[PDB]
Amino acid sequence: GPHSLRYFVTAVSRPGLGEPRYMEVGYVDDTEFVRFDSDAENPRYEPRARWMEQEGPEYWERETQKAKGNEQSFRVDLRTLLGYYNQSKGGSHTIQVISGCEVGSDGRLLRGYQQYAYDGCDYIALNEDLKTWTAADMAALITKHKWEQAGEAERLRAYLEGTCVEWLRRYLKNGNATLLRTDSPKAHVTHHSRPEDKVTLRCWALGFYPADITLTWQLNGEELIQDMELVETRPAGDGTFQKWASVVVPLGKEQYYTCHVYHQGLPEPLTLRW
């Protein structure tokens, strides 16, 4: 199936409390695999996935040097944006970036992307054509021009189509046992009483990987999507995810409702009842 290499970057200024905090967190699909935190006792790029032990010392030194270079670059960016927006030096501000590429099952690039945000709002983004930028405001229009004159889009395209793709393939290979596995979810239903002769039936799905899953409740064969409670799929601390979906039904009518779980680790979907 498709796979992706994504980096979530954050730069937050802490006026009065010293230098801003800088963080890089990398992901291959739903798995965190590398991280850098400027607040760390010893700021170094560190592995977050066991399979990353296959990379030599030179890998960690290079990535650490780049991250520190990025830290300095974003320190300046925070100052620059105060100018663009005419903001005072005393406030805390945030720059967020999501950068990455995705390859199909055969390892060829499907798409590459890069998007910036300032204080929680879109700032500038690379367009699907990987050649042009789109600014969310006049400030971003300043950056757009700078980048066009520096030929930045070409440099980024080189990375997205090259480095990003090749390293993504490499990570998928070295960590294939972890990244290409499939953990089948284990599901169960809980019952909770409520006032006015009604009950809450909750359908739980635990220990699955990849994170993609579909949990639905049905009555008369119709899926009750509109009348359904649900949490976003969440990591459970060991590389797997969980999710639950609930429905409040009339007391004594619980047996007319079934929970269905669809996941790639299930040849046939699970059907549960209380």
Partner: protein, 99 residues
């Protein structure tokens, strides 16, 4: 942008007293990123707590996971206390083992 965090507390496996497990506190959809997360066992702060799985959603709000290993007992209670500027009083969410 200021967004109040959604705090979810849950274990890796259905709790079984005496069996090791992992307690999770997923703090999601918040902004700005400044936040203090504490996991508590019987009202006392737990030291060995790992932070991971940080990400942003499409609206740019933050998601972070705080987790620690633990072996449930019938008399031990757990909770996650979160301090964030979008709130005046810190919020404590208890682990509901009957959820």
């Amino acid at each position: 942008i200021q967004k109040t965090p959604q705090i979810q507390v849950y274990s890796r496996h259905p709790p079984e007293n005496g069996k090791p497990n992992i307690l999770n506190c997923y703090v999601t959809q918040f902004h700005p990123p400044h936040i203090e997360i504490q996991m508590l066992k019987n009202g006392k702060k737990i030291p060995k707590v790992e932070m991971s799985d940080m990400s942003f959603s499409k609206d740019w709000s933050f998601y972070i996971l705080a987790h620690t290993e633990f072996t449930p007992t019938e008399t031990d209670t757990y909770a996650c206390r979160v301090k964030h500027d979008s709130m005046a009083e810190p919020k404590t969410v208890y682990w509901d083992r009957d959820m």
